Write a protein that binds this ligand. Structure first.
Ligand code: CLA
Ligand code: CLA
Ligand code: CLA
Ligand code: CLA
Ligand code: CLA
Ligand code: CLA
Ligand code: CLA
Ligand SMILES: CCCCCCCCCCCCCCCC(=O)OC[C@H](COP(=O)(O)OC[C@@H](O)CO)OC(=O)CCCCCCCCCCCCCCC
Ligand SMILES: CC1=C(/C=C/C(C)=C/C=C/C(C)=C/C=C/C=C(C)/C=C/C=C(C)/C=C/C2=C(C)CCCC2(C)C)C(C)(C)CCC1
Ligand SMILES: CC1=C(/C=C/C(C)=C/C=C/C(C)=C/C=C/C=C(C)/C=C/C=C(C)/C=C/C2=C(C)CCCC2(C)C)C(C)(C)CCC1
Ligand SMILES: CC1=C(C/C=C(\C)CCC[C@H](C)CCC[C@H](C)CCCC(C)C)C(=O)c2ccccc2C1=O
Ligand code: SF4
Ligand code: SF4
Ligand SMILES: [Ca+2]
Lengths: 733, 153, 138, 30, 79, 80, 37
């Protein structure tokens, strides 16, 4: 009656549907009552400020619990031996067995071992005492306070920006490319050369000797005179020990391009030089778009001048399409962020840049799986907001004959081709897996279809991995690429070739016939998830089953049992199905990564290389073999430290099967069941006294599709996090 | 952007609408204390006021009392708190006997003789109950410590 | 009790619970020019064009206001009326009780409070002993 | 290690983001 | 006894530069630049909108800023 | 309440007005078809949203549309 | 649950409050709020 104050149509139904739909609709600011575009944008802006403060309070809490309850002082003595403590366990339910089991990593209290890798990150960026982390945590509390005050300030009518301020794409691109992506990268290169590189070489550069101690014995006058070679004078020698001065070198910017031979990570000077180059390129890229002064570009001119014969209108009227639509902007942002979160995951495991994080295996597994799951979620959200844009903000009159109109003008062709490629690739990946499985089971493993993944092996050979016998570009030192004949500027190449050809690191893993089939399974998952997502994006405006879906919106339940039956026709239901396929694909690739690295870390790579080509190899050497240490986390004899992970394993199974309840059984059964329960309550003595204000109804169709999806997701993630974190910590620390 | 208006739009009443006296948080919080909450019978608001003060008055004599350095540390605090709640309820009922003798309306159910008598009764029950429950937690402090830390679980 | 109130920002000096339990006093004056006066409750306010209605809690505050309306303004405001309004609702009419201010002889008033003697012929308390009276009122 | 009063100092500092978050969320609710 | 530098071309260079920055701050900041005593060649200063007051004010602030820069940078060492 | 809209493509076949359980719909005279009648939705605050009227409509695509909206007691079919 | 770290009484008081007082108070206020008017 009062709760969903943003929508009067929800403050009228006397059911529990208004509670559920108030919680769900609360952030869809476009559908609130009394909403103009200006109030939309200002409310969005202050919501962003609140969320920035959420992020800063979260990292403040991580810092404060590493500082207060963690063994950061002890861990930076020998990071290889001591496990990093995340925070302290305090619940009154623990028996004596659990308290003695969870006392670990040199503590008195029960503690949680940190698998987020924040210890390695804080140790690499130069933080070496609990007081430094406490100062960082209080500083981030103050920064979060500042952003909360900024959000409250920009809700004040004097400081509320106009619509022309929010619709200013060129100035925002200038200040984000230059001032946010370039100045922050420059400032990080400054922290690296002033604090992280010197304290990696031994000396303390705090806030007190910050100005008194130059990073280089040469001042900034060599930087101004152009003689920049002194900053790369003597690099860190290959016998350098992190945190102390043995063969330091005193070169703040070098480009060795290999790995540190002791921390197994990249050199901090190489990181600083990288961020300096990135800052220079991003700063000059932020001077591209027109602003109050005369020079620059206007994006409308750039877009509208790209008209070809094979598209016709080209990109005409795409500036107003992107600028006026917030779901287009959110789809582009989520697509790029999902791509670069995949990129973060794929590069932080093969090119680690933190001290001793390539030798702590559980945190590397947790970080990879975490960022690949975030990347899958963000990519699915990009396509979800593509569908929401096509429903809500898409104008087929202004977007006449441009690239968007021609996306929708042939959607059947590309949906049918995604159908063909996903069917083709799925038929033959399952065919090869079932063939290998059947002929291995029939006692004849020599009959397997084992395909050498020659293309990726050739890619590795082009990057310098000389194991496979190709001598093409960098594996052939006589070639034009390896010598770089005009200048011989390959300063990175000796270090890179020394790092790619060592069998220890995860940089360019050896790829065999078991990797071919899982890459094609991953391609199948990507293609089928993309098929469902674009089949919801392009059919959001209507198919022949329902030529008007733009008027029912994004997430209507169905269209009745007529027209044959119309159960999951909304674009939201294509989100739903592609959410399942995303979870499957990320399960496939994280299963593959996990088993490949359990082979690599243990040294017994033969297990993956012969047993990953058929499905019971995946089932008995990975799922069954590696859960042995998991389910024995608590047995009738006792309890060890992998007991909360066994409990989370079972917990995730339970959440998953409850998701099955919501996805399989549908609303009619539950509505008549609740009708019987309502009769029971209204007709019993002593409980007639208590009456509902909101009449109990079953969850809606789309609501319980969402709830089953949430259960499937949460149980799926909790089960796999428990398994992946207890299987590595079962056998690696 | 003025934050200090007059009270309730009346510029001649002797009150300002400052951010402490007449804010939204103050209206929703002061106006939802038991002394001001809407619809409550006087017995329940007196009971809720009473427990908040019986639980309070245990502490000052328990930690700072003539018995704070003996084995009957909590019994002296409880005895002092019962003395204070007794004289508090005697004062409350005397105030009810005095103020509400001339007949008045029923715009507020608390500002009447039956309403103030119910308030005093609820205050007595709540005050002595809160005093005894704070005594019971303080006397059995080893038990509460052990169950919050997990010495018996 | 017609009249828009003065543009006053509010104050803590003013009407306590005496105003809505027993009498409070209203002063009504009419001025052509908008200007600034000192409220006896403390502060400064704005005289509206035309009629004003200021609610005060004491009669002395109303007469002090009317006094400064008379003496501190060059276009002297002398058509000010002071009422005594009750929470029950009825309005009394107090300060210009007759037509003209009390300093001027209206010639239709009654001499009450006037004794027919000077203070020297006041009776003495020994004569009126245990009479329930006091030497003035005999 | 870390001090006893640094934790309480962090708590009374974080009381300021609490107040500002409460006031920002209240102002968003309008 | 904080460190200091006696005098050089570097001391002369930096204080002239701080005087230039004080010229910029004075021209962008002073409300009444042209008001005051009359001035010779006012087109040279800011085109007849600058006075003998703001001559001494801006470059006096330049000397204050330059004393700050000279003493601070010589105490920190790098000058 | 749900809004039931009837479009120009109605052929007056009466199928929707007798497929409706709550008899929200009714036939009114019209001059745009051979049957000289079009469905109307007068008592559309009684529509539950069952879409049996859309199921019974023969014209393609649809001459009657139900647009589910603000739920009430009448439009949710609650006996309690 | 002994606490070796600084201010071990602080989790002793903050686990009941975040476990009970924050949920009971938050659900009580939200129950009054979503059902008001
Ligand atoms: C130079 C000036 C400048 C700066 C610094 C910013 C900064 C910001 N703006 Mg602003 N803005 C500017 C001027 C500026 N703006 C101007 C002039 C306009 C008007 C035209 C706007 C209009 C505008 C609006 C309308 C919005 C923003 C928003 C924001 C925020 C977006 C960045 C963010 O939250 O993620 C931080 C992102 C980064 C630091 C970089 C991105 C990360 C890249 C991809 C590198 C990846 C990280 C790397 C791999 C390793 C990191 C890992 C390590 C942490 C462990 C941020 C606080 C939004 C916001 O939050 O509002 C509060 C918002 O809604 N701004
Ligand atoms: C940058 C991130 C971002 C932004 C700002 C938005 C913002 C928006 N999305 Mg979302 N979305 C994103 C990422 C993003 N999304 C991703 C990554 C996914 C894939 C999982 C999607 C999938 C998606 C769907 C399919 C839908 C939206 C819709 C919405 C809109 C309403 C939000 C809402 O109903 O939530 C309100 C809050 C809830 C419903 C709570 C449930 C969320 C989880 C289960 C609880 C987590 C809370 C916990 C404490 C943390 C809003 C415009 C909806 C809409 O109507 O668009 C117009 C819509 O139907 N989103
Ligand atoms: C073991 C489980 C399983 C299997 C094999 C399939 C199989 C397939 N799904 Mg999928 N899917 C599943 C579970 C499964 N799914 C679940 C749980 C959901 C979540 C709700 C979905 C949701 C779903 C969506 C929404 C879509 C599919 C599609 C399809 C096709 C993908 C093309 C492909 O992989 O090549 C075919 C590979 C196969 C292995 C086919 C299995 C047939 C085997 C070989 C035996 C056939 C021989 C004979 C009949 C017996 C294919 C039929 C997509 C599609 O149809 O695109 C054309 C589609 O859009 N799926
Ligand atoms: C012989 C008759 C008798 C007895 C047994 C009591 C018994 C009691 N009365 Mg009392 N009461 C009585 C007559 C009596 N009353 C009379 C005649 C009056 C009318 C003025 C009152 C008015 C009175 C008030 C207003 C209150 C009590 C309350 C109390 C209780 C404890 C406090 C007390 O008075 O100390 C024991 C007292 C005696 C043994 C002597 C009683 C005779 C005097 C006149 C009592 C006067 C009480 C005084 C005004 C305030 C209490 C003082 C106390 C706190 C020390 C107790 C049950 C209080 C209570 O807890 O109620 C919930 C309460 O609020 N009584
Ligand atoms: C920005 C460039 C620059 C540089 C590198 C320095 C650097 C310094 N100045 Mg300097 N200064 C500058 C320009 C600069 N100044 C300018 C432009 C002015 C002219 C207005 C001054 C005016 C100034 C004075 C008046 C003094 C310094 C002093 C200081 C020293 C310590 C300051 C400190 O930490 O305060 C301490 C920081 C605090 C937060 C403490 C607050 C103290 C108050 C009383 C509270 C240090 C050598 C001090 C000195 O001589 O130290 C040797 C000093 O007293 N400077
Ligand atoms: C969002 C970040 C974050 C997260 C996930 C947690 C999580 C936790 N904290 Mg907290 N904490 C954080 C921020 C964080 N904290 C910050 C910024 C401070 C510095 C003041 C603290 C100070 C702190 C204390 C002093 C204690 C914990 C404790 C706890 C644990 C139990 C919860 C509890 O008692 O709440 C207590 C929470 C607070 C007193 C303040 C938390 C306020 C955060 C910022 C709210 C965030 C809002 C959210 C993002 C939406 C749990 C590990 C307890 C513990 O370790 O027991 C073993 C405990 O004693 N925390
Ligand atoms: C996240 C918060 C959390 C916390 C801190 C607790 C903590 C506790 N649980 Mg609980 N539990 C929780 C969540 C939590 N649980 C959830 C979510 C579940 C559901 C799955 C359970 C299921 C569970 C069961 C089924 C049982 C426990 C029990 C226990 C208690 C074991 C010791 C005991 O006998 O306590 C005794 C009880 C208490 C300490 C409660 C506090 C009451 C006292 C009187 C303090 C109140 C003081 C005073 C009256 C009011 C003061 C007001 C204040 C403003 C000053 C322990 C205090 C056991 C138990 O004994 O429960 C009673 C047990 O049987 N829990
Ligand atoms: C191999 C791994 C990646 C495979 C991804 C599969 C994508 C499917 C490819 C189908 C061919 C698409 C037909 C192109 C559709 C089309 O006709 O485009 C024709 C296009 C020329 O367009 P114009 O330059 O006339 O267009 C004007 C503006 O639209 C842009 O300049 O040239 C292309 O082939 C560029 C497309 C490459 C990017 C694809
Ligand atoms: C917003 C929106 C949307 C969108 C979304 C999506 C669809 C996304 C996706 C997209 C994506 C996600 C994409 C991706 C991308 C890719 C790429 C971009 C690739 C390429 C790369 C490159 C080109 C590289 C190359 C290379 C190599 C490989 C080696 C070295 C050298 C070089 C560097 C050259 C839609 C339309 C729905 C609707 C509307 C709205
Ligand atoms: C929050 C807050 C606040 C407050 C503060 C405080 C700190 C409070 C206090 C509180 C308190 C102070 C509480 C208490 C509680 C109590 C209780 C909870 C009690 C209970 C009781 C009982 C348990 C009783 C019962 C009984 C018994 C046992 C027996 C006898 C009788 C009877 C039945 C009565 C303020 C104002 C600042 C504002 C802000 C926020
Ligand atoms: C179980 C079930 C119900 C019954 C569910 C009901 C009646 C409500 C379920 C919630 C109960 C009250 C338990 C809630 C406890 C959870 C922890 C939710 C907490 C509340 C949120 C705000 C987090 C449906 O109504 C339904 C409808 C359509 C398809 C499938 C189903 C379905 O599977
Ligand atoms: S079963 Fe449910 S979703 Fe499917 S058509 Fe019927 S009402 Fe719609
Ligand atoms: S069922 Fe369709 S065509 Fe037939 S009368 Fe109804 S609206 Fe017209
Ligand atoms: Ca004593």
């Amino acid at each position: 009656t009062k709760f969903p104050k943003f929508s009067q149509d929800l403050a009228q139904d006397p059911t529990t549907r208004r509670i559920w739909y108030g919680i769900a609709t609360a952030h869809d600011f476009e559908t609130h009552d009394g909403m103009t575009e200006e109030n939309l944008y200002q409310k969005i802006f202050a919501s962003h400020f609140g969320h920035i403060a959420i992020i800063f309070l979260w990292t403040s809490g991580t810092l404060f619990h590493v500082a207060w309850q963690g063994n950061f002082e002890q861990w930076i003595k020998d990071p290889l031996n001591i496990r990093p403590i995340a925070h302290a366990i305090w619940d009154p339910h623990f028996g004596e067995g659990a308290v003695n089991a969870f006392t670990q990593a040199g503590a008195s209290n029960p503690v949680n071992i940190a698998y987020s890798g924040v210890y390695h990150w804080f140790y690499t960026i130069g933080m070496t005492t609990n007081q430094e982390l406490y100062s960082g945590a209080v500083f981030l509390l103050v920064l979060a306070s500042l952003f909360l005050f900024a959000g409250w300030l920009h809700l004040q009518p004097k400081f509320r920006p106009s619509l022309a301020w929010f619709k200013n794409a060129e100035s925002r691109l200038n200040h984000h490319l230059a001032g946010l992506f370039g100045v922050s990268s420059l400032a990080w290169a400054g922290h690296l050369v002033h604090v992280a590189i010197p304290e990696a070489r031994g000396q303390h550069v705090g806030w007190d000797n910050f100005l008194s101690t130059p990073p280089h014995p040469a001042g900034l006058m060599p930087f101004f005179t152009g003689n920049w070679g002194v900053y790369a004078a003597d690099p860190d020698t290959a016998g350098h020990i992190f945190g102390t001065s043995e063969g330091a070198g005193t070169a703040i910017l070098t480009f060795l391009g290999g790995f540190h031979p002791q921390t197994e990570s990249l050199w901090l000077t190489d990181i600083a030089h990288h961020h300096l180059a990135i800052a220079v390129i991003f700063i000059i890229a932020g001077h591209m778009y027109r602003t109050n002064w005369g020079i620059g570009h206007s994006i409308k001119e750039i877009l509208n001048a790209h008209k070809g014969p094979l598209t016709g209108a080209g990109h005409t009227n795409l500036y107003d399409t992107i600028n006026n639509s917030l779901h287009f902007q959110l789809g582009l942002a989520l697509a790029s962020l999902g791509v670069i979160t995949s990129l973060v995951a794929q590069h932080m495991y093969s090119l680690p840049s933190y001290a001793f994080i390539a030798q702590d295996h559980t945190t590397q597994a947790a970080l990879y799986t975490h960022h690949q799951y975030i990347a899958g979620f963000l990519m699915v959200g990009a396509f979800a907001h593509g569908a929401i844009f096509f429903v809500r903000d898409y104008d087929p009159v202004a977007n006449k004959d441009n690239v968007l109109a021609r996306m929708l003008e042939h959607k059947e062709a590309l949906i049918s081709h995604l159908s063909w490629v996903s069917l083709f690739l799925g038929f033959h990946t399952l065919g090869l897996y079932v063939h290998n499985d059947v002929v291995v089971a029939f006692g004849t493993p020599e009959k397997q279809i084992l395909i050498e993944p020659v293309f990726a092996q050739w890619i590795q050979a082009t990057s310098g991995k000389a194991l496979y016998g190709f001598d093409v570009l960098l594996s052939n030192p006589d070639s034009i690429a390896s010598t770089a004949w005009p200048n011989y500027g390959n300063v990175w190449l000796p270090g890179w070739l020394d790092a790619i050809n060592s069998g220890t690191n995860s940089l360019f893993l050896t790829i065999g016939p078991g990797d071919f089939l899982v890459h094609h399974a991953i391609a199948l998952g990507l293609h089928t998830t993309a098929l469902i997502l674009i089949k919801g994006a392009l059919d959001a405006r209507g198919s022949k089953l329902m030529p008007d879906k733009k008027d029912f919106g994004y997430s209507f339940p169905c269209d009745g049992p007529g027209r044959g039956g119309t159960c999951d026709i909304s674009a939201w239901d294509a989100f739903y199905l592609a959410m399942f396929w995303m979870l499957n694909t990320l399960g496939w690739l994280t299963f593959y990564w996990h088993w490949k690295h359990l082979g690599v870390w243990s040294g017994n790579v033969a297990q993956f290389n012969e047993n990953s080509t058929y499905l019971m190899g995946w089932f008995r050497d990975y799922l069954w073999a590696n859960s042995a240490q998991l389910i024995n986390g608590y047995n009738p004899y006792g309890v060890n430290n992998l007991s909360v992970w066994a409990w989370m394993f079972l917990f995730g199974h339970l959440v998953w099967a409850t998701g099955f309840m919501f996805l399989i059984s549908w609303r009619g059964y539950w509505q008549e069941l609740i009708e019987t329960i309502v009769w029971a309550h209204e007709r019993t003595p002593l409980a007639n006294l208590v009456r509902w204000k909101d009449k109990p109804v079953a969850l809606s169709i789309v609501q319980a599709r969402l709830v089953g999806l949430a259960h499937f997701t949460v149980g799926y993630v909790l089960t796999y996090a428990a398994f992946l974190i207890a299987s590595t910590a079962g056998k690696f620390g | 952007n003025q934050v200090v208006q007059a009270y309730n739009g009346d510029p001649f009443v002797g009150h300002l609408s400052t951010p402490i006296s007449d804010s939204a948080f103050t209206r929703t919080f002061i106006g939802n204390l038991p002394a001001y909450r809407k619809g409550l019978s006087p017995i329940l608001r007196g009971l809720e006021v009473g427990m908040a003060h019986g639980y309070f008055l245990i502490g000052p004599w328990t930690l700072l009392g003539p018995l704070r350095d003996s084995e009957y540390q909590y019994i002296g605090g409880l005895i002092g708190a019962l003395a204070l709640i007794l004289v508090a309820t005697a004062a409350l009922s005397s105030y009810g006997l005095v103020t509400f003798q001339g007949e008045q309306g029923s715009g507020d159910t608390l500002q009447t003789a039956d309403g103030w008598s119910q308030f005093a009764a609820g205050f007595f029950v709540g005050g002595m109950g809160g005093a005894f429950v704070a005594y019971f937690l303080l006397e059995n402090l080893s038990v509460v410590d052990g169950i919050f830390r997990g010495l018996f679980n | 009790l017609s009249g828009q109130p003065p543009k006053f920002g509010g104050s803590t000096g003013g009407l306590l619970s005496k105003a809505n339990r027993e009498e409070k006093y209203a002063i009504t004056w009419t001025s052509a020019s908008e200007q600034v006066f000192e409220m006896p409750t403390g502060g400064a306010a704005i005289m509206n064009e035309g009629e004003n209605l200021l609610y005060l809690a004491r009669k002395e505050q109303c007469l002090a206001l009317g006094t400064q309306l008379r003496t501190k303004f060059k276009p002297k405001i002398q058509d000010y009326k002071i009422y005594r309004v009750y929470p029950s609702g009825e309005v009394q009419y107090l300060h210009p009780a007759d037509g003209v201010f009390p300093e001027k002889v209206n010639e239709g008033r009654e001499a009450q409070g006037t004794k027919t003697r000077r203070i020297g012929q006041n009776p003495e308390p020994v004569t009126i002993k245990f009479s329930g009276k006091a030497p003035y009122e005999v | 290690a870390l001090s006893d009063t640094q934790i309480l100092a962090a708590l009374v500092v974080a009381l300021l983001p609490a107040f500002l978050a409460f006031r920002l969320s209240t102002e968003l609710y309008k | 006894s904080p460190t200091t530098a006696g005098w050089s071309l570097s001391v002369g260079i930096i204080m002239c530069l701080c005087n230039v920055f004080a010229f910029v701050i004075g021209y962008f900041a002073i409300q009444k630049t042209g008001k005051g005593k009359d001035l010779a060649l006012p087109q040279l200063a800011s085109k007849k909108t600058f006075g003998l007051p703001e001559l001494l004010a801006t470059m006096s602030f330049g000397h204050i800023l330059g004393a700050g820069m000279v003493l601070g940078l010589a105490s920190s060492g790098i000058l | 309440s749900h809004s039931v809209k009837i479009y120009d493509t109605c052929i007056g076949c009466t199928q929707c007005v007798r497929a409706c359980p709550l008899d929200v719909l009714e036939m009114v005279p019209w001059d745009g078809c051979k049957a000289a009648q079009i469905a109307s939705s007068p008592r559309t605050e009684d529509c539950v949203g069952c879409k049996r009227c859309e199921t019974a409509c023969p014209t393609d695509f649809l001459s009657i549309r139900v647009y589910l909206g603000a739920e009430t007691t009448r439009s949710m079919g609650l006996a309690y | 649950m002994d606490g070796s770290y600084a201010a071990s009484y602080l989790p002793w008081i903050l686990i009941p409050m975040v476990g009970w007082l924050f949920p009971a108070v938050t659900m009580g206020l939200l129950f009054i709020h979503i059902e008001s008017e």
